[PDB]
Design an enzyme around this catalytic site. Structure first.
Site, PDB file in Angstrom:
ATOM      1  CB  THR A 136      -0.974   0.010   1.188  1.00  0.00           C
ATOM      2  OG1 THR A 136      -1.841  -1.120   1.063  1.00  0.00           O
ATOM      3  CG2 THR A 136      -1.799   1.279   1.271  1.00  0.00           C
ATOM      4  CD  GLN A 137       4.302   2.431  -3.905  1.00  0.00           C
ATOM      5  OE1 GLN A 137       4.359   3.516  -4.486  1.00  0.00           O
ATOM      6  NE2 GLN A 137       4.973   1.367  -4.316  1.00  0.00           N
TER       7      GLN A 137
END
Ligand SMILES: [Mg+2]
Ligand SMILES: [Mg+2]
Ligand SMILES: [Mg+2]
Lengths: 212, 222, 235, 233, 231, 240, 195, 204, 4, 244, 4
Positions: free
Chosen positions: D1-2
């Site tokens: 998750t960015q």
């Protein structure tokens, strides 16, 4: 869904509906909710379609390996416990199964085991499983006796699914009937609720709630 | 937070005849209110007279079709070039789908072809691999629009023999390839009118013992 | 000492060649393939008269359409059978069909060479894998600890193999009936067996498309032994 | 998750009779701050492919390294590395497409939308799109971000379907692209005036054009706009 | 002698005896021939039987639509190496949408065989392979040896009395290389080549195994009544 | 981990480590199994070079695997404990999953499987132990007697002996045991077992152990005096 | 699952366990035995999360049965309770803990004394004259505080238990379909068939 | 669902002239429901006494753990562990489970056999040592105990006087806490004799 | 997700 | 590779013996004699220290007699270092059992587990066996007073009186001669010393060359006391019996 | 816990 199995003098009676839903959408009315594991073993499906179908097919493989290894047909107890021990390993992962393992062996006689995905395993004479179980129980319990004939028992099983098929929005399509004896399971046909309802209403004089 | 799934829209439709089967799908690919492509096929020949479509999230759809095509290739290698029967393919796809039970393929899968008796067959799958043979199945965005029409026109549901007092049903019968393609084209034009994610083009793959033929038809582009 | 996976100067694996010597010491097993079915027969060879001969299980079911006879260190075969049975059932679960006899044999033969320094030594047992499938019909396979398998019209393995194989060479033709094959296995077993052949020290089985794999009762085999002796005296 | 930090905006592209055109502005945005003005978002691979990348620039620079490394690896034990066994656009795309989908499936995506424009060895035009989800599609015209909303409509007026590609010249096609870049400068708040444009032609080869500027802009009509309703002065 | 216990030991003259003994297993193996033109590549394999009751050991394996090999020596080792090639060919397709070059196929087999000749516990592969294929640079024939040495050739042969066929192909080189757009004539040249390696036995219908790949021909194997044409 | 292949083939096709394990069994004290019409009896030799023993606490030669199955052995005592422990665990594991105690055949097949695994596993030597496994299947009155050996082969026996001078007592049982008419009663079966051990043992004092297994988990070990009565009776009939 | 009671008297331990198995708005079964015999003179009743209850009970039963065979000896009730507690004490800091609460009623043959142990799913063990689990305690404990005497007979213990079941049937919201009663004493475990 | 206040209970330790006292209530409940009136929270390993309040399963587990450890200590050292050393062992053991701790409030008490010095110590749940001349308090009525001890306590009390002070401290604190009481136990510890007294207190 |  | 240098510690001789077990027993036969004698009211453990030096610290020394728990002790014969590994394992096994069942470990269970560890080193792992024999002297409420021995083979047996180490043949004949079942602890103490006195390789048996221990119920009412004898206590018991 |  709505599945019932009960024990009586003449063996075991197994009745299921054929409806599959995706919320309020009717996906299919032609679904086989009974799995024929072997000539003396039946499996009923409720809850998740994929989960029931996949793992009860897998159960059939494990029962075949048992009779190859032990040169003897698996007991209903052992078969039910392979499935109950499997789902228990996945407990909390979110499998959804309401299951009845019905069959006959020499050592046990006719036997029914309720097995669900939170790991409950119960032996019993009567079980109704699915969204429409309460509707099936209502008709089944109020008419059930041990001394029912094979003809009457088959009808009560059929009539109990029809009762649920009517009231439960998530049950219907058709009724699939099975009779389990000492000689194995016998298929007693597919009965479309479309025709069966009006036939029963007319002949029985029941369903007076409905505009005839 | 990162959402790994998306909806690429479109709709698919499989019908089974006596000695043939069709698998049709619109060629529109969308995200939200934007058109990505007016021609992006999602109905594939997988060999051994099996045609396959995995409608929904195109990425998961392509991944699955790719894996099954590969499954067919290794079946030949491991079992002396034996032909993969449609029933055997169906069970194989159940295992592919259910393999990702706890991170599913966000697709509705339909395959079509001939059974081992040479008769038309259609198999449809939920996202996690519950499957069932049918005469008839619509899949994807406009499934809810097309399916009840198919129930009425293919399986002749709710239709009674005129003057029989609604006692004798209209008898079931196999449709000709000409009659089936009429229903597919009318299903898709109707779907295109009332569903925004359906249109642009219609691509039909017809499966007979002679092999896999294709037909293409324009749809409205609004 | 020396490595387990070592090559001899002639270009053979020592441990594989030594396991073949162990298989020669094993009890006789004979298979004959016909267009009416495949027959599997074995010498039981009870070490003592107190040993209950019906407990000697040298013919084994893998699936309904595939049988198996063994010769050599028969204890080594248990895990090979277990694998074959799992392979057969697993294939049926994945593909909703019976598994080809050749594909089953190939799966067993993949274990053979998974030894070294995986298990510590090769298997000390040879298998006759008999079966039927829709594609290639009735088949008989010889699976060795080398990982090689040959298809045979007929094959003998064990102590009396070279003598029995020479006999099978003359007798076998492509028009043998199942009943002719049964008698031929009984005939050749009686020739190469030390002790005199009866229903207690020899076992027959067959695989047919219709009835699948069936191990014959001592009562059934006894009638075939009596039928065999009468026919040999009759000319 | 960015979450993407430094980002590039629209990449726009279309096919014409003999090849493909691709273009992308030279801006690296840091949210609403227009931070970096010297950023090249078109990366040529060999002499027959250009990869246009929008989204996170750190992930773009990673993909640059992967493509640079792919060319090196392809040359290893390959006497025909500059001939029959040279990298095709279709090879380069499928590689990136595989990576993008593997990363999304590990819940750690490369936060990018990628367009691979090129010409195959047999002279066929190649134009295909892939994004952080691993979604792939092909079309006579392709665009990312605002380009998908504003460029595609204008480019589709030129090449509406397949049969329009042989009828479209490089002059007409380039004009449509340069017009689209101007429209994006008017209406995209994270766009810049400066951009790069690449033409991959099956005859003339790869033509890479740097330091282009949006020009012939209509602003004059602004003088006559007073208030938002009732104001006259 | 004292230096043939394992593959990790060099002889005083700088030889790997375990690799040379593995090479010996190929010489004992049944003859197989490989040859190519510019359009097609052909494998011809003499299959071997245990006796008259047994089947004939299948020598030719398909790796992809455009590639496959013939084997001579330990068949299980050929199954391991062929399975590895299938995966590498398959990896090239799925990841790069690219048919694996026959030259890279060779390089990959070479490197896999090598690792088994430098590590304790393991053993060299006991099989030789002839890989034919049609890729982006036309027809190809490779000879793999389990030492790791892979060689690209116009034609060759490996197995027992392979020297007979190899001498014939060396003479016929100029003829068979220019059999372009004619499958049947290139096979005939391959069948005539393998005939030079025969002693007492002749080519029968269930004895001969032929495979072909070319410009508009997927890798296809011919056995039984399909090869009766060429006897 | 220690990986060495200790059990390997020799040129003549023998696995010497398995054959040397049989020599350890041949050294072990004699053990005999005789199954009657409605019972099995396990007799065991105890060498009399050990006086000042404590027979209360000394490991007994016959071990209960479950309430209905027993296991005697010949060979290395320390090795036997590992087989017995694994068998006892598999017995409870079978009850837990199958909801039914093991058959004697199944329990034998498991123990035999364990012995086999150690003959082609790296870093381990074979078990220097042969076992006699006796008992009755659940809800069954047919007596069961099985034998295992280091190689991993197992088989059913009407009567069988293992250990030192086992060939002498097997000779005895071969002519004295009738297949058509097995020992009809418990007394007959125990007597034939004691008789067979008296060919080999030395004295019938604290040298013979007898365990009687009967259907429905009915297992009891005979005391010195009980066994001594059989020894006294046999010797008086012998003098003829 | 829900109601499990235990009363230690002079010469025996009495375990009462409700017969109802409810899921949703359906009583699936009305004859369920929520107990396992661990050894001839040790009985364990259990209540808690579906599946976990039986899976835990049978796992303990197998381990005690294994010990009994290995040593040819019956573990004391104190010893069995200590073993069971440690298993739950491990469980609570596991990935997915057993949500099972148990009563262990046993007769120590060496001491000639009945013993009742109450162990919750956390691994909280206590020896008690009388114990209960879930909401049952909120009624039975105050009732037994009053009516219980330590020198009572088995028959007096059963009458004291009837008084508990009557109070629960009167004031408990849910229908638990009566109880199965079992007595643990010097002669082992037997079930009262008419309650 | 606060682990430290489910079961409830209190421990208090005090120092006198050549003596120490440690006392605890007997209640074990499940929140409102009182379950056991016999649950002692004070254990001993030789001449070293340990009181443990908090989650009762951890009270039991730690007692079993320190018995285990002190037993091996005695076999290897060939002498009984001293209070100062045991205090360090408790601290080490608790901090070993720093990111999954035992929900307990332990209290060490005893006289060093070599020096004859009275010693008491308290710990937090992560194992931080709280050494004190006067008194240590622990449990659900710690606030109450702090108030009672700080006012009642004086230095160098004789064993018989120290008994009255610690007993009144515990009793009056326990009566102002819902989850504490239901009986109490006081240990009076001299160099080479230990008296254990059960107190009469209100049973609500 | 299909239900039953 | 390394195969060249492998002794193969866990293989059979052609005769069916374990080489390394046989040679480990040969090792133990040169170790100082250790005797265990079990009486009706206690157990005696006696052990002869290996040829003592006059400058060895005798009082703060432990070579032969070790404590496993409050109810069980062992006498060692063989490599002291090897024994201490097995003793620490035994001590832990005893505390594991106490933690689990809140009951002291029965003597035989502890002996079986320690013997099972030794067995392992003879069947797998390719390591040398432990060159150690034990005499286990212990009490539990099931069997009361119990003597056992274990040896490198991992085989264990129960005894009324037993010797391990040097001159066991001579020692076992003298014990078998003078032992009887109704013997008291004080009588067993005398027998133990008289046995060592005759079987010793030394000129005369003295206090400084002996370790001595008793496990009596000589404490106050139905509880067991372990007594590891002090140098001065061995000197007194040696004069009392009239050996010096 | 404790803090300082
Ligand atoms: Mg539309
Ligand atoms: Mg509690
Ligand atoms: Mg109160």
């Amino acid at each position: 869904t709505t599945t019932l199995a009960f024990r009586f003098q003449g063996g075991i009676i197994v009745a299921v509906d054929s409806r599959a839903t995706a919320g309020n959408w009717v996906a299919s009315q032609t679904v086989k909710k009974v799995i024929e594991i072997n000539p003396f073993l039946l499996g009923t499906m409720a809850g998740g379609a994929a989960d029931c179908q996949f793992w009860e097919t897998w159960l059939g493989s494990q029962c075949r390996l048992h009779e190859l290894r032990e040169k003897e047909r698996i007991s209903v107890a052992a078969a039910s416990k392979i499935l109950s021990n499997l789902v228990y390993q996945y407990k909390g992962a979110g499998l959804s199964m309401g299951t009845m393992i019905c069959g006959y062996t020499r050592k046990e006689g006719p036997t029914i085991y309720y097995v669900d995905s939170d790991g409950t395993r119960l032996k019993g004479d009567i079980f109704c499983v699915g969204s429409g179980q309460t509707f099936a129980y209502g008709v089944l319990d109020s008419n059930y006796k041990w001394d029912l004939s094979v003809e009457d028992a088959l009808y009560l099983g059929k009539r109990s699914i029809l009762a649920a098929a009517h009231r439960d929005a998530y049950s219907g399509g058709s009724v699939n009937l099975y009779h389990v004896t000492e000689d194995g399971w016998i298929y007693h046909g597919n009965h479309d609720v479309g025709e069966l309802f009006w036939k029963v209403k007319e002949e029985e004089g029941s369903f007076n709630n409905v505009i005839g | 937070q990162f959402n790994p799934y998306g909806d690429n829209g479109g709709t698919i439709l499989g019908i089974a005849g006596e000695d043939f089967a069709v698998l049709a799908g619109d060629t529109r690919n969308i995200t939200d209110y934007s058109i990505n492509s007016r021609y992006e096929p999602k109905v594939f020949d997988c060999g051994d007279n099996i045609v396959m479509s995995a409608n929904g999230f195109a990425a998961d759809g392509d991944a699955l079709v790719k894996r099954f095509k590969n499954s067919v290739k290794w079946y030949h290698f491991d079992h002396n070039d034996k032909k993969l029967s449609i029933n055997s393919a169906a069970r194989n796809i159940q295992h592919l789908l259910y393999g990702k039970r706890f991170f599913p393929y966000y697709v509705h899968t339909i395959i079509a072809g001939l059974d081992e008796d040479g008769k038309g067959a259609v198999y449809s799958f939920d996202p996690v691999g519950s499957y069932e043979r049918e005469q008839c199945r619509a899949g994807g965005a406009a499934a809810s629009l097309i399916m009840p029409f198919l129930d009425n026109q293919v399986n002749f549901k709710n239709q009674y023999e005129p003057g029989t007092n609604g006692k004798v049903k209209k008898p079931l019968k196999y449709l000709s390839v000409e009659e089936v393609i009429k229903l597919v084209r009318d299903s898709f034009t109707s779907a295109t009118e009332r569903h925004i994610q359906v249109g642009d083009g219609l691509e039909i793959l017809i499966v007979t013992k002679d092999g896999v033929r294709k037909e293409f038809y324009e749809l409205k582009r609004d | 000492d020396r490595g387990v996976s070592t090559f001899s100067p002639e270009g053979r694996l020592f441990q594989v060649e030594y396991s073949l010597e162990a298989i020669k010491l094993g009890s006789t097993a004979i298979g004959i393939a016909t267009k009416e079915g495949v027959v599997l027969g074995v010498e039981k060879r009870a070490t003592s008269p107190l040993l209950e001969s019906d407990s000697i299980e040298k013919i084994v079911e893998i699936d309904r359409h595939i049988g198996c006879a063994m010769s050599g260190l028969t204890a080594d075969a248990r895990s090979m059978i277990e694998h074959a049975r799992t392979a057969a059932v697993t294939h049926n679960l994945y593909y909703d069909e019976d598994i080809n006899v050749e594909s089953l044999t190939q799966s067993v033969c993949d274990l053979a060479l998974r030894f070294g320094e995986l298990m510590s030594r090769p298997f000390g047992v040879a298998l006759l894998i008999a079966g039927h499938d829709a594609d290639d019909g009735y088949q008989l396979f010889h699976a060795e600890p080398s990982g090689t398998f040959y298809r045979y019209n007929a094959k003998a393995i064990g102590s009396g193999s070279e003598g029995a194989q020479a006999e099978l060479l003359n007798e076998w033709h492509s028009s043998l009936t199942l009943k002719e094959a049964e008698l031929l296995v009984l005939k050749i077993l009686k020739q190469v067996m030390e002790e005199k052949l009866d229903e207690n020290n020899a076992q027959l089985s067959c695989i047919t498309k219709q009835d699948g794999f069936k191990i014959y009762d001592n009562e059934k085999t006894a009638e075939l032994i009596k039928e065999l002796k009468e026919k040999e005296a009759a000319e | 998750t960015q979450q993407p930090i430094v980002t590039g905006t629209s990449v726009i592209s279309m096919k014409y009779d003999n090849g493909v055109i691709i273009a992308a502005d030279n801006l690296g945005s840091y949210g609403s701050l227009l931070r970096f003005n010297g950023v090249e978002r078109l990366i040529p691979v060999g002499d027959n492919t250009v990869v246009g990348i929008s989204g996170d620039i750190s992930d773009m620079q990673h993909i640059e390294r992967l493509l640079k490394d792919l060319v090196t690896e392809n040359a290893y034990d390959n006497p025909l590395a500059d001939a029959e066994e040279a990298l095709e656009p279709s090879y380069i795309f499928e590689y990136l497409a595989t990576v993008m989908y593997q990363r999304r499936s590990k819940m750690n995506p490369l936060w990018n939308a990628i367009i691979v424009a090129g010409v195959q060895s047999n002279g066929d035009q190649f134009l295909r799109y892939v994004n952080l989800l691993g979604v792939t599609y092909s079309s006579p015209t392709l665009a990312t971000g605002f380009g998908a909303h504003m460029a595609n409509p204008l480019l589709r007026k030129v090449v509406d379907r397949e049969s329009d590609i042989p009828k479209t010249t490089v002059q007409v096609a380039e004009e449509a692209i340069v017009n689209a870049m101007r429209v994006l400068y008017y209406r995209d708040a994270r766009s810049s005036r400066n951009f790069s444009l690449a033409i991959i032609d099956k005859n003339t080869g790869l033509t890479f054009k740097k330091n282009l500027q949006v020009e012939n802009m209509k602003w004059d009509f602004a003088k006559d706009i007073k208030g938002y309703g009732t104001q006259k002065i | 002698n004292n230096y043939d216990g394992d593959t990790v030991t060099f002889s005083p003259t700088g030889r790997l005896f375990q690799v040379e003994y593995a090479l010996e297993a190929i010489k004992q193996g049944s003859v197989t021939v490989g040859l190519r033109s510019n359009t097609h590549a052909v494998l011809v394999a003499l299959k071997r039987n245990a006796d008259e009751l047994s089947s004939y050991q299948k020598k030719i394996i398909k790796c992809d639509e455009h590639m496959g090999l013939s084997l001579a020596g330990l068949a299980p080792d050929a199954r391991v190496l062929s399975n590895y090639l299938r995966q590498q060919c398959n990896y090239s397709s799925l990841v790069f949408n690219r048919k694996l070059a026959v030259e890279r196929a060779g390089h990959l087999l070479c490197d896999k065989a090598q690792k088994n000749t430098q590590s304790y516990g393991g053993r060299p592969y006991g099989v030789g392979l002839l890989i034919i294929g049609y890729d982006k640079s036309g027809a190809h024939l490779l000879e793999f040896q389990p030492s790791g040495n892979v060689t690209e050739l116009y034609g060759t042969a490996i197995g027992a009395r392979s020297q007979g066929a190899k001498t014939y192909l060396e003479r016929t080189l100029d003829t068979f290389i220019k059999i372009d757009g004619n499958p049947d004539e290139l096979i005939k040249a391959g069948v005539e080549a393998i005939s030079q390696s025969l002693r007492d036995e002749s080519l029968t219908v269930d004895n001969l195994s032929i495979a072909i790949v070319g410009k508009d021909t997927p890798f296809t194997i011919y056995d039984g009544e399909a090869v009766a044409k060429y006897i | 981990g220690y990986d060495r292949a200790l059990s390997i083939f020799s040129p003549d096709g023998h696995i010497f480590q398995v054959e040397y394990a049989l020599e350890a069994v041949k050294r072990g004290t004699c053990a005999v199994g005789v199954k009657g019409k409605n019972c099995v009896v396990l007799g065991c030799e105890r060498r009399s070079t050990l006086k000042l023993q404590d027979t209360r606490i000394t490991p007994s030669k016959v071990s209960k695997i479950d309430s209905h199955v027993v296991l005697s052995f010949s060979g290395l005592n320390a090795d036997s404990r590992i087989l017995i422990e694994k068998a006892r665990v598999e017995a409870q594991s079978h009850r837990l999953t199958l909801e039914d105690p093991v058959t004697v055949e199944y329990l034998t097949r498991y123990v035999a499987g364990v012995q086999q695994r150690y003959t082609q596993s790296g870093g381990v030597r074979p078990f220097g132990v042969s076992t006699l496994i006796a008992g009755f299947d659940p809800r069954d009155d047919e007596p069961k007697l099985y034998q295992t050996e280091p190689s991993g082969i197992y088989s059913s026996w009407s009567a069988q002996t293992i250990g030192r001078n086992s060939k002498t007592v097997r000779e005895f049982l071969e002519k004295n045991y009738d297949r058509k008419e097995p020992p009809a009663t418990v007394e007959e079966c125990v007597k034939l077992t004691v008789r067979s051990l008296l060919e080999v043992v030395q004295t019938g004092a604290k040298n013979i152990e007898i365990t009687v297994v009967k259907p429905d988990s009915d297992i009891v070990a005979l005391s010195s005096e009980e066994i001594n009565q059989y020894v006294t009776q046999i010797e008086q009939e012998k003098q003829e | 699952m829900d109601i499990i009671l235990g009363i230690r008297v002079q010469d025996s331990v009495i375990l009462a366990s409700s017969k109802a198995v409810t899921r949703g708005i359906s009583v699936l079964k009305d004859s369920d035995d929520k107990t396992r015999q661990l050894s001839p003179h040790t009985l364990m009743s259990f209540a808690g999360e579906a599946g976990d209850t039986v899976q835990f009970a049978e796992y303990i039963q197998a381990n005690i049965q294994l010990y009994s065979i290995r040593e040819d000896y019956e573990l004391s009730p104190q010893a069995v309770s200590s073993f069971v507690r440690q298993e739950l004490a491990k469980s609570i800091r596991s990935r997915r803990p057993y949500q099972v609460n148990v009563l262990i009623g046993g007769y120590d043959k060496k001491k000639n004394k009945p013993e009742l142990y109450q162990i919750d799913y956390l691994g909280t063990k206590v020896e008690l004259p009388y114990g209960a689990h879930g909401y049952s305690g909120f009624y039975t404990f105050s009732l037994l505080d009053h009516h219980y005497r330590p020198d009572m007979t088995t028959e007096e213990g059963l009458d004291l238990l009837k008084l508990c079941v009557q109070e629960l049937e009167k004031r408990m919201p849910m229908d638990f379909k009566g109880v199965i009663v079992k007595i643990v004493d010097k002669d082992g475990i037997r079930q009262v068939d008419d309650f | 669902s606060d682990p430290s206040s489910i079961n409830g209970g209190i421990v208090v330790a005090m120092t006198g002239k050549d003596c120490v006292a440690i006392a605890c209530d007997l209640r074990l409940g499940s929140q409102s429901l009182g379950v056991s009136n016999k649950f002692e929270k004070i254990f001993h390993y030789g001449h070293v006494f340990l009181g443990i309040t908090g989650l009762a399963t951890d009270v039991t587990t730690l007692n079993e753990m320190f018995r285990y450890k002190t037993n091996l200590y005695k076999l290897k050292e060939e002498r009984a562990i001293e209070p100062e050393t045991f205090t360090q062992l408790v601290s080490s053991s608790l901090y070993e489970r720093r990111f999954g701790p035992y929900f307990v409030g332990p209290v060490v008490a005893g006289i060093n056999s070599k020096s004859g010095k009275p010693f008491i110590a308290g710990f937090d749940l992560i194992g931080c040592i709280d050494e004190a001349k006067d008194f240590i308090v622990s449990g659900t009525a710690s606030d109450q105990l702090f108030g009672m001890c700080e006012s009642l306590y004086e230095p160098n009390l004789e064993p018989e006087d120290l008994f009255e002070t610690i007993s009144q401290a515990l009793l009056n604190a326990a009566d102002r806490d819902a989850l504490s009481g239901w009986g109490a136990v006081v240990y009076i510890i001299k160099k080479d004799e230990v008296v254990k007294r059960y107190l009469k207190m209100r049973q609500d | 997700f299909l239900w039953x | 590779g390394s195969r060249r240098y492998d002794s193969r510690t866990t293989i059979f001789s052609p005769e069916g013996r374990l080489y390394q077990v046989e040679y480990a027993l040969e090792s133990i036969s040169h170790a100082g004699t250790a005797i265990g004698i079990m009486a009706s009211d206690g157990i005696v453990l006696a052990a002869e220290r290996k040829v003592t030096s006059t400058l060895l610290e005798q009082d703060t020394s432990t070579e032969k007699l070790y404590k496993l728990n409050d109810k069980i002790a062992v006498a060692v014969a063989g490599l002291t270092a090897d024994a201490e590994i097995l003793i620490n394992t035994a001590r832990i096994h005893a505390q594991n059992y106490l933690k689990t069942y809140n009951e002291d470990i029965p003597v035989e269970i502890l002996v079986r587990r320690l013997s099972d560890i030794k067995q392992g080193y003879t069947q797998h792992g390719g390591l040398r066996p432990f060159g150690v024999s034990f005499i286990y002297a212990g009490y539990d409420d099931r069997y009361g007073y119990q003597l056992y021995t274990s040896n490198p083979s991992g085989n264990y047996t129960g005894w009324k009186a037993i010797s391990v180490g040097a001159n066991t043949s001579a020692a076992q004949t003298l014990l078998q001669m003078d032992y009887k079942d109704d013997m008291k602890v004080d009588d067993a103490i005398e027998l133990a010393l008289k046995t060592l006195s005759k079987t010793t390789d030394s000129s005369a048996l003295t206090y400084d060359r002996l370790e001595f221990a008793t496990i009596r119920k000589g404490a106050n009412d139905g509880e067991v006391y372990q007594k590891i004898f002090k140098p001065q206590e061995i000197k007194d018991i040696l004069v009392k019996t009239g050996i010096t």
